[PDB]
Short mmCIF file of C-alpha atoms and ligand atoms in Angstrom, two decimals:
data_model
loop_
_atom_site.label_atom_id
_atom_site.label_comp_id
_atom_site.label_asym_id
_atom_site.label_seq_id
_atom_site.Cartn_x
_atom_site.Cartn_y
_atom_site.Cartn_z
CA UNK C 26 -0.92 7.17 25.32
CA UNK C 27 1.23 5.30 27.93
CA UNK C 28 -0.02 1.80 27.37
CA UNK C 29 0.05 1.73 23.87
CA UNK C 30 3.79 3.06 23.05
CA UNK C 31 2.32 2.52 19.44
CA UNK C 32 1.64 5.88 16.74
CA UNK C 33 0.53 6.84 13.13
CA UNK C 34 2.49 8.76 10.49
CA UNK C 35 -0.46 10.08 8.86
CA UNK C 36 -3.01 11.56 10.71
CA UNK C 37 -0.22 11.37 13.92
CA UNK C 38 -2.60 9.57 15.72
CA UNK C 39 -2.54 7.01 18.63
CA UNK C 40 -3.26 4.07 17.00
CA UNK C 41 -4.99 1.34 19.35
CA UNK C 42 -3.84 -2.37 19.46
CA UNK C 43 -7.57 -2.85 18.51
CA UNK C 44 -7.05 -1.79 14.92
CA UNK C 45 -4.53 -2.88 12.55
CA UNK C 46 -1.31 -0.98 11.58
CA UNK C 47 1.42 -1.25 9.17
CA UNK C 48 4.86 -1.06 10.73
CA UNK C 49 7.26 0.20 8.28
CA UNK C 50 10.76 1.36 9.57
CA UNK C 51 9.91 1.82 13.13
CA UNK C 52 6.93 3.95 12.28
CA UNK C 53 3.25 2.98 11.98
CA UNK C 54 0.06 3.51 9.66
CA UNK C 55 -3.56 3.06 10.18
CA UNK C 56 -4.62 0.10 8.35
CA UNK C 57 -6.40 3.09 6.33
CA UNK C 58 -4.01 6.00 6.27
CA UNK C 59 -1.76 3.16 4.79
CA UNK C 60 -3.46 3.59 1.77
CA UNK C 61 -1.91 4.46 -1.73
CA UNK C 62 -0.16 7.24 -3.23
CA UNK C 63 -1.98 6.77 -7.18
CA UNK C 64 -5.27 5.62 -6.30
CA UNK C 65 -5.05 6.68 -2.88
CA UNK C 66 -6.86 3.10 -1.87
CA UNK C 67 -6.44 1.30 1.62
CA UNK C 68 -4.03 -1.75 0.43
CA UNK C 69 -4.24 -3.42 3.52
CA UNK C 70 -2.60 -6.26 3.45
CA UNK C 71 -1.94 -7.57 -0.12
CA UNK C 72 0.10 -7.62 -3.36
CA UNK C 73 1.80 -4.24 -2.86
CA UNK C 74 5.10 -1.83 -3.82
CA UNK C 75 5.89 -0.35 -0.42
CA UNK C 76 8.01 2.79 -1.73
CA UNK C 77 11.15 4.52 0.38
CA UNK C 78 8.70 7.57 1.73
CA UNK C 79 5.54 6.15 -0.06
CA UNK C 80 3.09 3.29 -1.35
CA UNK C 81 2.09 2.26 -4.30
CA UNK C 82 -0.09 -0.85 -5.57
CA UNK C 83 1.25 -3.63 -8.34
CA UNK C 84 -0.49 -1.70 -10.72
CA UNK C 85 -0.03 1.42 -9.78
CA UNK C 86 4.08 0.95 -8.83
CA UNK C 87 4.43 -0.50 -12.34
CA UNK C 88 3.41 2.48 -14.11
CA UNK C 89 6.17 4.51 -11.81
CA UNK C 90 8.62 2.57 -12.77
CA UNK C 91 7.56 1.79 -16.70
CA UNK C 92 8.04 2.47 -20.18
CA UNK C 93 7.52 6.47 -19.67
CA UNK C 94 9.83 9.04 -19.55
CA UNK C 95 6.62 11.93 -19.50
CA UNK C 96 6.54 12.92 -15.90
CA UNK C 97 5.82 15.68 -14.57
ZN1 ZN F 120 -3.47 7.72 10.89
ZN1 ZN F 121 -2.73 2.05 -6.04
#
């Protein structure tokens, strides 16, 4: 609300200074809602691709950006 001049992305939610956020550009993401874009798993706060407009894990960025040109 007023207090907390703090907001998610995903769900476009007020996200409490209780709960952790990711603070990318400006914008925030529930600890959760932060999660990825292949597995679609809560990273949190670990080894991990942040994309431009997305997320993606070390495993899971790696296969975006390796040896295959079938996509689609
Ligand atoms: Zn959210
Ligand atoms: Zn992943």
């Amino acid at each position: 609300g007023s207090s907390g001049s703090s907001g998610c992305q995903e769900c476009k939610k007020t996200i409490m200074p209780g709960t952790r956020k990711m603070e990318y550009k400006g914008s925030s993401w529930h600890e959760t809602c932060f999660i990825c874009h292949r597995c679609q798993q809560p990273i949190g706060t670990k080894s991990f691709i942040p994309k431009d407009n997305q997320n993606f894990c070390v495993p899971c960025y790696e296969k975006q950006h390796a040896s295959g040109p079938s996509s689609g």
